[PDB]
Structure 1
Amino acid sequence: SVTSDRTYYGYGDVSVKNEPVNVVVSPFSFPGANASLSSGGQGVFKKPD
């Protein structure tokens, strides 16, 4: 009578949500406060973070 269609199934799901990286920024204001930059001046400025 019944000629079974021999076909069973298995399934799965994958969730890719985020991007690998977050670039958190703290911008710099290099002449800063309690220091001074002059025209034609020479030197170095550094922000560690």
Structure 2
Amino acid sequence: SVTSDRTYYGYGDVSVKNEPVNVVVSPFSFPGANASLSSGGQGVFKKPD
């Protein structure tokens, strides 16, 4: 007696939470400790991490 509207459903959800990367900074204080940078000087400074 009923004319069914033939439509059933399925569903799902997608969760995009974080950003791809975290650029953790540990800044450099390049004259350093137990060192010295003078005017006109020339050299190299290294920070591994």
The 4+ residue runs of structure 1 with deviation greater than 6 A are none
Which structure 2 residue ranges, 5 or more long, are not aligned? Answer: none
Distance in 2 separating the partners of 1:10 and 1:32: 62
> TM-score, length-normalised on structure 2?
0.97
Which structure 1 residue ranges, 5 or more long, are not aligned? Answer: none
The two structures, once aligned, show a CA RMSD in angstroms of 0.4
- Helix, strand or coil for the counterpart of 2:18? coil
Identity %: 100
Residues 10-21 of structure 1 correspond to what in structure 2 (within 5 A)? 10-21=10-21
Across the two proteins, how many residue pairs are aligned to each other? 49
